[PDB]
Structures are given as structure tokens and as C-alpha cells.
């Protein structure tokens, strides 16, 4: 079925939970043996969220190459994404090592450091120009260059230096600051505006390594971001945009990381975002 009318048909019939459970039943199951080794327990935020072995990002280190991060490679859309958990106190250096080794231009953050009174990820970037950060375990330096605070998101320019080679690179930090502590946003307008700002920066384009995107677990809000982007790109590329099937795209993405889209409300929000976004693209 088309999307917008499939949407109203699920609303009128109140069957979002049943649609979402079908997805969970059909989703791929692949091994995640490296994630479950005992030496990696303090590298995982949640015991039930792990990268599959076949798609995990490997650190270029011979001691321990493990990080909780997955490469989502979308062949028809010609887009790649790295989805990862919010960094932990003992993985902030690994996180920036990955950004460096994978040649990423942008980092997309969809959570606040504190939500619901609890810490959802480490404070992994510097907050003042004159107070830079040094990650001694991975030999990297990170400096805040500039910061632009808007009503729904903040963009930061960062300098990452490989202290071993003295090479430097500019990284863009795109921080969506207004996702509610509970539920999903009422309108997708600010999320779509944010996606378009990431796009306009070059961070999603083939001349750079994959964008790094995270929330707390790296599967829920993060899944909404890449699912909406890929669906809109396919609607631009195909002769028949109504052929784009958001449930099929989500099941393809779940071949590369488990659990993408965590609730039936996040599923409905993803439909809403693609539907509204397809009208703004034209027109
Ligand atoms: O597809 C395009 C390219 C032109 C820029 C652009 N901007 C926005 C959208 C879509 C596009 C939306 O879907 C809503 C937010 C703004």
C-alpha cells in the first residue's frame, strides 16, 4: 500500500502495536559473540543492545578492537551510517578513535546528557574554547572552535588532532536538544529541519566517511533518523515514489543492527516524518 493512506488505515484501526510486533517477529537474528566476551562488559551500556559480529566497527588496535557500534550500509539509497551508543566514561577515547579512523565529518547526537534525572551518556566534548580535552588512551586532542545555539538544536565546530601524527580535522557536532523525556515529538517539523541541516553540511555525503549517530542505546531515536533519511532519498531516486515501503526499509536496516525503532510510537513518528518530508522536498 502507499504510505499516507496505510497510515490513516492504521490510525483508524488502532493497530500500531500489532504492526510493530510483526516487525519484531520478522527481524534478523545474527550472532554478537564479540560484544558478549567478559573483557568487554564495561564497553556496553545495556546488556540487551549489542552489535552483530558481521557489521560491527573495529577499532584499529591490536589489544582490544571492540566498540558498541554498527555500519548500516544502504545499497539502493547509496548511504552509509554508523549507529552507536552514547559514550561511557571508559569509552570516550574509543569513540573519538572511531570518528578519526572512519574519516567521519559529522557526529549526530539525539539525546541530552541528563534525562529523567539520570545520566544518558558521558560529557564527551569540551564546553569552553580554552578548556580542551585530551584522551590519553587513544592519543587524541579535541578543541571547541565555535558553537551556534538555536531553539531546537545546537551546531558545534570541533577540531580533532591525532597527537601521534599532528594531523588535524574539522568535525561538525549536530545536537538535537528538544526530544521529550517521554514519548515522541507531537510534530516532525523540527526533526525534519534538523535532518536537512545535517544534509546541507556535507556530513552525509560520499566524499566523507559515514556519519556517526547516537542516542543513549543507539537504536531508537537513532533508528528514526536514518530510516527517515533513507526513505526520503529513495522517494527522490525512484520513478514511482509510492513504491517506497517503510517497513521493508526498516527490516533491511535491522540486518545490520538489532532493535532499530524501539516502540510503536517511534514507528508512527517515522511514518509521519517521511510523509511530511515528502511534501516539502517538492512541491
Ligand atoms: O528535499 C529537500 C531539498 C531542499 C531542502 C529541504 N528542506 C526541507 C525539507 C526538504 C528539503 C523538508 O522536508 C522539511 C524541512 C526543510
Residue 79 makes CB contacts below 8 A (sequence gap 6+) with 204, 226, 229, 230, 233
Are 94 and 136 contacting, i.e. CB atoms less than 8 angstroms apart?
no
Domain range enclosing 8: 1-283
Residue 183 in grid coordinates: 514519548
CB 3 within 8 A of CB 244: yes
Exposed, middle or buried: residue 12 (CB in 10 Å: 0-12, 13-18, 19+)?
exposed
User: How far away, in angstroms, is 281 Cα from ligand 1 center?
Assistant: 5
The candidate with the shortest Cα–Cα distance to 95, out of 59, 148, 146, is 59
Using CA atoms, how far apart are residues 90 and 98, in angstroms rounded to an integer?
Answer: 14
Q: Given its phi and psi angles, is residue 222 left (phi above 0), alpha (psi -120 to 50 degrees) or beta?
A: alpha
Which three-class secondary structure string do you get for the chain?
CCHHHHHHHHHHHCCHHHHHHHHHHHCCCCCCCCCCCHHHHHHCCCCCCCCCHHHEEECCCCCCCEEEEEEEEECCCCEEEEEECCCCCCCHHHHHHHHHHCCECEEEECCCCEECCEECCCCCCCCCCCCCEEECCCCEEEEEEEEEECCCEEEEEEEEEECCCCEEEEEEEEEECCCCCCCCCCCCHHHHHHHHHHHHCCCCCCCCECEEEECCCCCCHHHHHHHHHHHHHHHHHCCCHHHCCHHHHHHHHCCCCCCCCCCHHHHHHHHHHHHHHHHHHHC
Cα–Cα distance between 48 and 61 in angstroms, integer?
A: 25
| 126 CB burial (10 A radius; 0-12, 13-18, 19+) | middle
Phi, then psi, of 98 in degrees rounded to 5: -60, -50
Sign of CA dihedral 198, 199, 204, 206: negative
Non-local (6+) Cβ contacts of 146 within 8 A are 156, 157
264-282 and 221-237 are packed helices; what angle lies between their axes, rounded to 10 degrees? 40
Task: List all residues whose CB is within 6 A of at least one atom of ligand 1.
Answer: 192-193, 196, 277, 280-281
Find the 194 Cα to ligand 1 centroid distance in Å. Answer: 10
Answer whether 83's CB lies under 8 Å from 219's CB. yes
The residue to which cell 538555536 is assigned: 150
Nearest to 31 by CA among 258, 266, 272, 264: 258
Catalytic residues: 215
Separation of CA 80 and ligand 1 centre (Å): 20
Alpha carbon of 120 to those of 87, 147, 158, 216: distances in Å?
Answer: 9, 22, 22, 5
Rg of the chain over Cα atoms, rounded to whole angstroms, equals 19
The values of phi and psi at residue 225, to 5°, are: -60, -55
Report whether 19 belongs to an annotated binding site.
Answer: no
Which residue is closest in CA terms to ligand 1's atom 4?
281
Residue nearest to atom 10 of ligand 1 (CA): 281
Contact yes or no for 241/277 (Cβ under 8 A): no
Q: Ligand 1 centroid to 118 CA: how many Å?
A: 35
Place of cell 589489544: 63
Q: Is 134 annotated as a binding residue?
A: no
Tell the residue number behind the cell numbers 555525503, with chain if given: 205
Cβ 213 vs Cβ 81: under 8 Å: yes
**For residue 239, with 0-12 CB atoms within 10 Å meaning exposed, 13-18 middle and 19 or more buried, which class applies?**
exposed
Ligand 1: centre distance to CA 127 (Å): 30
Q: Is 215 annotated as a binding residue?
A: yes
Residue 265's closest CA among 219, 224, 231, 232?
Answer: 224
Q: Is 224 exposed, middle or buried (0-12, 13-18, 19+ CB in 10 A)?
A: buried
- For the four alpha carbons of 134, 140, 141 and 143, in that order, the dihedral sign comes to negative
Enter the C-alpha cell of residue 259.
532493535
Domain count across the chain: 1
Is 218 one of the annotated binding-site residues? yes
Are 85 and 217 in contact by the 8 Å Cβ rule? The answer is yes
Q: 83 and 218 in contact (C-beta within 8 Å)?
A: yes
- CATH number of the domain residue 151 falls in: 3.90.190.10
What is the Cα–Cα distance from 283 to 280, expressed in whole angstroms? 6
Mutate to test the pocket of ligand 1, among 281, 282, 283 (most ligand atoms within 8 A of CB): 281
Check the annotation: does 117 bind a ligand: no
CA distances from 275 to 6, 94, 156, 269 (A): 11, 37, 29, 10
- Picking from 94, 68, 95, the residue whose alpha carbon sits closest to that of residue 217 is 68
Query: In angstroms, how far is the first alpha carbon of the chain from the final one?
Result: 22
Residue with CA at minimum distance from ligand 1 atom 7: 196
Give me the half-sphere count of Cα atoms (radius 13 Å) on the Cβ side of residue 205.
Answer: 9
Q: Whose CA is nearest to atom 1 of ligand 1?
A: 281
Contact partners, residue 20, CB within 8 Å, separation at least 6: 261, 263, 264, 267
Q: How many other CB atoms are there within 10 angstroms of residue 254's CB atom? A: 23
Hey, what's the torsion of the CAs at 280, 256, 118, 131, to 10 degrees? Answer: -80
Amino acid at each position: 500500500m502507499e504510505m499516507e493512506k496505510e497510515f490513516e488505515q492504521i490510525d483508524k484501526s488502532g493497530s500500531w502495536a500489532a504492526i510493530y510486533q510483526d516487525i519484531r517477529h520478522e527481524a534478523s537474528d545474527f550472532p554478537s559473540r564479540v560484544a558478549k566476551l567478559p573483557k568487554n562488559k564495561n564497553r556496553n551500556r545495556y546488556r540487551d543492545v549489542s552489535p552483530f559480529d558481521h557489521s560491527r566497527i573495529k577499532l584499529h588496535q591490536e589489544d582490544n578492537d571492540y566498540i558498541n557500534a554498527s555500519l548500516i550500509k544502504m545499497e539502493e539509497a547509496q548511504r552509509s551510517y554508523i549507529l552507536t551508543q552514547g559514550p561511557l566514561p571508559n569509552t570516550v577515547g574509543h569513540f573519538w578513535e572511531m570518528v578519526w579512523e572512519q574519516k567521519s565529518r559529522g557526529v549526530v547526537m539525539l539525546n541530552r546528557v541528563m534525562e529523567k534525572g539520570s545520566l544518558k551518556c558521558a560529557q564527551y566534548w569540551p564546553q569552553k574554547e580554552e578548556k580542551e580535552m585530551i584522551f590519553e588512551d587513544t592519543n587524541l586532542k579535541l578543541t571547541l572552535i565555535s558553537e551556534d545555539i538555536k531553539s531546537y538544536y545546537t551546531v558545534r565546530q570541533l577540531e580533532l588532532e591525532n597527537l601521534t601524527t599532528q594531523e588535524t580535522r574539522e568535525i561538525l557536532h549536530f545536537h538535537y536538544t528538544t526530544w521529550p523525556d517521554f514519548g515522541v515529538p507531537e510534530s516532525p517539523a523540527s526533526f525534519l529541519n534538523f535532518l536537512f541541516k545535517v544534509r546541507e553540511s556535507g556530513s552525509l555525503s560520499p566524499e566523507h566517511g559515514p556519519v556517526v549517530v547516537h542516542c543513549s542505546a543507539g537504536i531508537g531515536r537513532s533508528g528514526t533518523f536514518c530510516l527517515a533519511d533513507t526513505c526520503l532519498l529513495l522517494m527522490d531516486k525512484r520513478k514511482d515514489p509510492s513504491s517506497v515501503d517503510i517497513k521493508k526499509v526498516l527490516l533491511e536496516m535491522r540486518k545490520f543492527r538489532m532493535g532499530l525503532i524501539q516502540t510503536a510510537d517511534q514507528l508512527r513518528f517515522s511514518y509521519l516524518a517521511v510523509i511530511e518530508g515528502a511534501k516539502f522536498i517538492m512541491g
